[PDB]
Amino acid sequence: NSEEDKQYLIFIKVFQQAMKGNFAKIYAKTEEGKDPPIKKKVERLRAELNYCYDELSFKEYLSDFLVRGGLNKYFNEHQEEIALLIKKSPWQEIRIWSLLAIASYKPKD
């Protein structure tokens, strides 16, 4: 319930879809008998998330991550809501939401 909670939940879904896309890209990148990453890529994503300062850097990185995720239906249905949510809101809160999405993305894969 509540509009803010619904927007937050479906933004979590958006971020989880983006991480699925990025992890699939990493899977396609690696070849041969080398083990593709599962967990240390999540650690890399965490390190890149905490490497953030000011509003500009984090929003740039988040937008780049979302685009690199590729196709995503949750952002498809909700353009205005997530565009406003990302453009507005403190960047630290959005980082908290992104980390919460990271910690609960894995049931998909």
């Binding site: 650690e43 890399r44 390190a47 890149e48 905490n50 490497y51 300062y53 000011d54």
Partner: protein, 288 residues
């Protein structure tokens, strides 16, 4: 009397990666935070400058309780009991022996963190272990910053066990060794290029951070309008103000400089001459 030497020194323009933060991942980040106008500036810790001053005191002879080994990167104490009367470093920087003559000393030098004159925008340098083989320690990133640095310090001269030890401290501030950082790839000389010193006998300073930028992405540096207003309004006695460095040219190019009260301050373009005059005044006042 209680004589204090306050001062703000501005470094030279260059690529700097001096003080870093927690290791994080593969990228070494600078120590940065909000300074002015909500913009993020890069900082150099005052402990780094204190370590550089200690190293200067050690290199130029002198008696220092802490001896930097410089070979095994270890710190050795010549005497386990701190003696501010004998050792320069104990007299100047103080000490604190907590494990269980007084065991603690307040030190005669008080520094503040060096603040980059320019906001830190981007400036991450890619680094590779090279070769054809690759491993975890192959791709890394290092943050740098093309800016001048500016820090504020104050000396309680009367607090010194030996009043003459202020002179080596001024010499060290002038010829400062490398301030802790990645000097292998980012060699940043921390010697001053502009000085605003005040040799007064009261606690108020009003010269904390007198340097401000113009065109926020440029190397040009100017005295802040607040400092000039402070000098002109009547506060900050010009006879106690020592200004030296490359800021002297900009100060003299100002209009109505001759009629300004700032003209009555001790202004020397050559830093050595300004330091010599200031040390003459200090020796006269302290009875050295």
């Amino acid at each position: 009397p209680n004589y204090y030497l306050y001062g703000t020194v501005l470094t030279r323009y260059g690529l700097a990666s001096l003080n870093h933060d927690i290791r994080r991942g593969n990228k070494t980040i600078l120590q940065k935070g909000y300074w002015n106008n909500g913009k993020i500036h890069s900082f150099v810790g005052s402990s780094a400058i204190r370590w550089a001053l200690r190293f200067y005191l050690q290199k130029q002879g002198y008696l220092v309780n802490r001896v930097w080994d410089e070979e095994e990167h270890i710190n050795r104490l010549t005497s386990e009991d701190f003696d501010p009367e004998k050792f320069y470093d104990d007299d100047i920087f103080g000490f604190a022996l907590l494990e269980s003559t007084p065991n603690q000393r307040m030190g005669a030098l008080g520094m503040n963190m060096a603040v980059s004159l320019t906001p830190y925008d981007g400036a991450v340098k890619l680094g590779a272990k090279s070769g054809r083989e690759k491993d975890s320690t192959s791709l890394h990133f290092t943050e740098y910053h093309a800016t001048r640095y500016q820090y504020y310090f104050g000396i309680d001269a009367t607090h010194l066990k030996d009043f003459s030890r202020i002179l080596p401290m001024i010499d060290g501030i002038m010829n400062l060794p490398k301030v802790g950082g990645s000097s292998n790839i980012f060699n940043y000389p921390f010697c001053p290029d502009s000085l605003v010193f005040q040799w007064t006998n009261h606690f108020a300073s009003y010269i904390s951070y007198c340097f401000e930028y113009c065109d926020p992405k440029s190397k040009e540096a100017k005295l802040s309008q607040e400092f000039i207003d402070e000098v002109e309004c009547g506060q900050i006695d010009p006879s106690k103000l020592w200004i030296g460095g490359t800021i002297v040219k900009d100060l003299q190019q100002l209009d109505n400089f001759e009629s300004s009260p700032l003209n009555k301050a001790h202004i020397y373009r050559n830093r050595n001459e300004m330091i010599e005059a200031l040390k003459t005044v200090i020796k006269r006042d302290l009875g050295l």
